[PDB]
Symmetry: C5
Subunit: 329 residues, 5 copies
């Protein structure tokens, strides 16, 4: 039906003349995973192309579109899109190549394929884990400059659809939209580039329950010492030491999961402030013990330091929490 043997498909339509326009639209099937250690995400989508080539015209009386097997895609000419700044990708091939080709009697062509991509995304963790991130996926032609191929969104802002099943267990997904920009390479020229943009927001419940509550409970345990007879030395000393030693484990367990950045995160501040709060309660009792021994040496109830600590330590911690949650909201 299609006159495939007649023509040299190594050359584009309009070869030697003005640029060929090619339109694009997209449907996202899933957003698959995200990594902070590697700074990347994975996405699966359907991608579609539109153009006209009169070498693929055929006669009919119905003026309708026809579908063809799919093994003809490797005989005709086809555009050459690639994903910019991507780590890896593939096209699906079970039970056969997931490819579709439809042609109109005047030579208009529709071409579609299903693909999975993993792409680069630079992340900022200064407000972690109360953070927000923004991402994009880039599309461009490899071989042809804007003097030979013209690339655009087919229907404007309506060119992007999203599956209603899309979900991530740790993030809220929002603000899908599309943009365009021109790009330059020194050795080869100017190119059109298409963008798909979106925003992510992290859920905090896991981190409350797994980090912020136990640190608070250790701080509250250290306060119990102020309520115990100053004469019970082998009770008051280990009570403080054990809380110091636990707070160290919590600090280690948090930071072992993240990338080794060169700046402080919002969770680090909270944990290290709680550490100094616990550390100071040990020096307090050391002072009380020394001053009591001096009194014994002079001579040979509740001490004022205990009496004041019972008020001062909790008030200070409450002030710190008010400030912190005013800053990070």
């Amino acid at each position: 039906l299609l006159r495939i043997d007649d023509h040299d498909f190594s050359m584009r339509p309009g070869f030697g003349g003005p640029a060929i326009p090619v339109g694009v639209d997209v449907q996202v099937e899933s957003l698959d995973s995200i990594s902070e250690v590697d700074m990347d995400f994975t996405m699966t989508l359907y991608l579609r192309h539109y153009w006209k080539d009169e070498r693929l015209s055929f006669p009919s009386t119905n003026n309708l579109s026809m579908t063809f097997d799919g093994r003809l895609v490797k005989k005709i000419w086809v555009p050459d899109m690639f994903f910019v700044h991507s780590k890896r990708s593939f096209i699906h091939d079970t039970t056969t190549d997931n490819v579709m080709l439809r042609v109109q009697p005047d030579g208009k062509v529709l071409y579609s394929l299903r693909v999975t991509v993993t792409a680069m995304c630079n992340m900022d963790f200064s407000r972690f884990p109360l953070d927000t991130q923004t991402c994009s996926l880039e599309i461009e032609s490899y071989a042809y400059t804007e003097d030979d191929l013209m690339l655009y969104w087919k229907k404007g802002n309506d060119s992007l659809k999203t599956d209603e099943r899309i979900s991530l267990s740790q993030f809220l997904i929002q603000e899908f939209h599309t943009t365009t920009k021109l790009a330059f390479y020194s050795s080869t020229g100017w190119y059109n580039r298409l963008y798909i943009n979106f925003t992510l927001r992290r859920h905090i419940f896991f981190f409350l329950l797994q980090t912020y509550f136990p640190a608070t409970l250790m701080v509250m345990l250290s306060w119990v010492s102020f309520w115990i007879d100053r004469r019970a030395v082998p009770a008051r000393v280990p009570l403080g030491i054990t809380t110091v030693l636990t707070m160290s484990t919590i600090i280690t367990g948090v930071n072992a999961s993240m990338p080794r950045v060169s700046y402080i995160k919002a969770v680090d501040i909270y944990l290290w402030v709680s550490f100094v709060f616990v550390f100071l309660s040990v020096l307090e009792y050391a002072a009380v013990n020394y001053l009591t021994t001096v009194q014994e040496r002079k001579e040979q109830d509740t001490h004022a330091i205990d009496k004041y600590s019972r008020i001062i330590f909790p008030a200070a911690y409450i002030l710190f929490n008010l400030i912190y949650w005013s800053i990070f909201s």
Copy 2:
């Protein structure tokens, strides 16, 4: 025998006319693995197709079906099924492609292949680990709409068989069955979709023995303090502190295995209630020590608080367990 050189197999049977019907049936060989962190499962199965094409007719006197090598599959026309919402898949190829082709003298065709698939499954962990999940595998044609191809289960509900060897170490598998539904894509049209459905139920014995028993034993250890002379301060203080510090480790060891969901699970409730039960026994003795020191200061047996705690703490824990196992059964 088969006139393969005579015809253009880029076009379907009945091209330009009414839709071709294609029937399907399936046998599941194994259900291979399941992930909560990734929310997916893996399955291996045999998949079969049935249709008629008169371009593949041949003469004989016996009216019987014949089997052909398998290298002819890439010369003739073949339907184009794909698995919807799937992460990855392949066809087996040792010692050769695991493919079968049988043809009748009137052009009826039987086509079979062996495949492994990994597929998406959304999971709810609010009753974990006493939870039940339901899953499905989706089948659809990539290129042809319901105006060109008609897809149906060959024998109705009898179209699905299951291997007697199928098993999972952590789940009971039940309720295999098949359904159909129509699907719409904005840019390309209407399609028939086939479903395979099943249900999973988790075994709880591992979690009893590995989580619920040790937390109970820590709670029962904290009660021993009420039976010890109030004068033995360096004994009664560490006995409580060490149980608090162990309960924290159990809490951490559980949640380090699961996805970071934004809601509380049924096991979290039990562990955090046990934590507060243990935490309170430390404040109890702090109160007894303070009140004894006040009595000493005034002046200068078993305390009522101990006497009452010996009854109140165990009764409250038993009430809590009755309620909990009434709710989660």
Copy 3:
């Protein structure tokens, strides 16, 4: 030499007539790994096929066998064996495909290839780690029923050889042998199936030294308490608590390595019995302390409980060990 252009190799020898017999023999090169979490093993072997096809006859005066390059395998007809219930496999291809083809002047053919397979194996862990497992590898034709192809072991029981280098660090390997059985699929018919069977036995030394000895040592540490003055409360209390808290870690470290089965293993019994032995020694001293305080209240040496515990606890543990190693031998 071979008349390859003359014939249609899409059709088997004797197409349209009685079944073709095909003989098989095997040499195992290595048994590569085993997984309890995944319930599978990996094997590498050489696999050989024997049949006659008169379309491959050629003239000679010597009546001897000749070897051919190997690129002819994709032109002639070849049998279609696959491994049943397998997870994955491949054929080796460095520096070229590891394939061999030899032909006799009357058309007798010998065909060989090297392959690696990973296969399913259901395992029972009720006597773990003193357990024994049995495994098998299954071989069958994909497309041809017993009416068209007949599959058998070439030399009877002599058809299976094993490399003298085969070894596993954790198991003793024994009892290699071969069997045959007929198989039925509802939609497609009856098939011949060949089996390779073997047995595995686990070495226990690692588990003695890494699990059973330290649990025993914790139990023996708990007994030291009975030998210490009942007046040293802050010594006798932590001595018991610390052993409870260590035994919990041993229990956790064992079960974190295995699949989450729904039944008790032989190592679980030992560890949980040792746990209760240690748990009881804490209640013992609690009783002694309470009864001493009652005597003080009445009034205002070694206690009989200590005196009896010094005999009763070790005797009971020794009785338990005699029974256990009588049952699991």
Copy 4:
């Protein structure tokens, strides 16, 4: 257009005569990851080739360059570059091969491709983590010696461009530049080799906060003992022991992450010196207890050892830190 059927492209241009010159230039897209355990890095780049072949001449009036599909690359002759000392690499192929071919009417050719490489890099950890590393990527022709192919940087030092987005979370990247050298293989001859060089510098903030601070805090905790009444034996003994036991965990947690080198690293020195500082404070109190018991035996305030330790231990640690940070800056 191009006379591809006319010529034998198994032979290079100028076959049997002087060497063909081939020029190269490069743009780096990303530096992807680095491993100390494996001693390697990963890089993604665009690579370009320039040469003339008169068998690819064609007539035109415009004297301009033309772009061709890309399926012609496997028909014509093309240079054979490989990456020396590399572990693995691939060329990107979605949605098609990422390859470009441009030709001028006189037969000048431009050839480009996108690739990812993982390459060997020998590392020195004697000043870890205050260390600096230098790396390079090597390029060479596989089959042709300098008598048949001549390989050079196209534009001198201007032949290397770098993407402005390039970043690593743990390193500062600096000093990109290019060099050339001749290489010899005994069996096959002399070859031209091109180099791409760069330098890396590690950020230290993570290691301060995660290793050096907690070790210092343990040392400062051990000093508190000198301020406590020498009569409180069950307080002063555990205070020292627990710090020894914590310092061991820090030492283990650091070295579990790195390769098992045969020499001491700069972080090892700090940690083991802090260990001996803590170890000595236990022997100190042992001495005080023994000497006090001797005084009791003779007979039957603050001891001079405590009085002097309160000054000597901190001064010594401060001297050690001054020296250390003078050496490692």
Copy 5:
């Protein structure tokens, strides 16, 4: 130039007559990694072949060798070497297949390729980590017996070269050399086999510092108890218990890294002897406490046991170390 269309390259040179000799030589580029858990190593090398075939003769006046593209390798005949007892391998293919072909006017051929291999190696850990291992890589023809192909090292012992960059962070590499042996398969015949042999020696510094020193320090901590007043029960009891409990962690941390062998390693002996040394110091004080209580009961300084332990325990440990390092050197 080469008459490729004239001949049947499915047949070897001298087909039907005496065996063809094929010579080999090798250059090792890198030794990439080693695993004790899997018992294997990985190697990358260049491999070369030499033979004569008069079907590849061509006329010239210069009598020199010529290089050809590399796409002709799949048209001519080529030998069929494979690596015996190997787990996996591949040939490098970026930017093209890393293959070289050179031919002389009389039909002498040189063939080269670059490859990476992973190979089996049986290891003995009875003297671990002071152990020495020996390894080899095996080379053989798949399809042709010694009656049809003759395989030998081209230049004798000079056939093996090694890159000066080769290094491993944990081993000293020594004693590279080559051997030959004949091999028999029951079903198929006799074959020539080539060997590459080498030796490895482990560096011990990591294990000194990470295992042997801390165990010694725990033993020395247990001795401090003998220097403390026998009346300080809550000090002397935990001092011993905590060292027992730490030594258990060291024992576990070592053996969690290695394969689960059925025999004792040299490091196990040291650690378990140190364990009993620490265990005995607890029974010592238990005895002293009991005997003191008996003296109190009779009645109603330093004990001889302490006095003797202060000499006996260290002397015994020093004797043990002398013997151990005399045996394992």
